[PDB]
Ligand binder design. Sequence first.
Ligand SMILES: Nc1ncnc2c1ncn2[C@@H]1O[C@H](COP(=O)(O)O[C@@H]2[C@H](O)[C@@H](COP(=O)(O)O[C@@H]3[C@H](O)[C@@H](COP(=O)(O)O)O[C@H]3n3cnc4c(N)ncnc43)O[C@H]2n2cnc3c(N)ncnc32)[C@@H](O)[C@H]1O
Length: 285
Amino acid sequence: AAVEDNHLLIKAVQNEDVDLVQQLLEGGANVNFQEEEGGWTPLHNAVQMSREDIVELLLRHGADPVLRKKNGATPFLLAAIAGSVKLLKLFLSKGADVNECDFYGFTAFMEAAVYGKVKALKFLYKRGANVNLRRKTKEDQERLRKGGATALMDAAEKGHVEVLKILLDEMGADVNACDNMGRNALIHALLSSDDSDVEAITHLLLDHGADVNVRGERGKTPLILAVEKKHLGLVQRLLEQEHIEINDTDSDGKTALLLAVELKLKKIAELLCKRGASTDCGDLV
Ligand SMILES: Nc1ncnc2c1ncn2[C@@H]1O[C@H](COP(=O)(O)O[C@@H]2[C@H](O)[C@@H](COP(=O)(O)O[C@@H]3[C@H](O)[C@@H](COP(=O)(O)O)O[C@H]3n3cnc4c(N)ncnc43)O[C@H]2n2cnc3c(N)ncnc32)[C@@H](O)[C@H]1O
């Protein structure tokens, strides 16, 4: 009976039924009940839905403002995902630390970057967020070379151009930080799954001196990734960089040129061939 009312409390929050939430709480429901799959509380749900009135109701009934769910996220971190400056401010007044993180290393600032929440990003910055923190994760994950990413890498990966610009021009983000795998923001940008913003992002990173001689998982370089995405403009800008190594091979033994030929990218292939050792570059495809 007690357990079903606790589940009803969570659903009432999710359905934004204030009167029912009040009734269940006054009836003795556990304001800090955690559901079994993810450890979510009433308060986590209220923050996720950006409902400041429900948040305040739960806090007045004794909700623990810093109680974490199973991934280690606090209400404060969920407020960053929601982009709610008012809730970020509230949890900072109740014991949150601006640089706190979940169990995979995500801070509020990183989450604002991931979710493109510019107002929250700016608020957090002015509250002392460390812009260049690298994700500290679980020992088992760190041993698999996971972890170490920054908010800039998240902005690059998710294609949030305005966030990226703010990070680089206003907040002192380090363009050439690398995660535990050796990937920088440039690699993460070229790995992204949305073809919408990759060109703009890559150009911005290169403007700020992003290092082109870096490797992702299976030996992939920025140049190889750009060839795989068939983007002539990006290959052109990458080749304008001074220290770029055109002859690097990925784990399959392929260079950018060999891949360009296989994908039948005539202009890219000729460009790459001309930069290399070969004398016969116009007739490859
Ligand atoms: N109201 C509710 N809303 C949502 N889910 C709910 C709700 N009520 C109950 N549930 C139940 O809870 C379960 C767990 O959901 P959770 O969000 O609490 O925990 C997720 C996962 O379990 C847990 C571990 O996931 P994973 O093993 O796939 O691990 C992901 C990745 O491999 C790892 C490291 O990332 P990286 O450093 O390599 O980039 O962190 C996770 N991750 C990726 N992006 C993240 C992000 N932006 N923020 C935080 N974590 C992120 O992380 C949460 N998570 C995953 N992707 C996320 C993302 N994009 N944004 C925010 N959180 C994310 C859910 O499965 C669900 O059944």
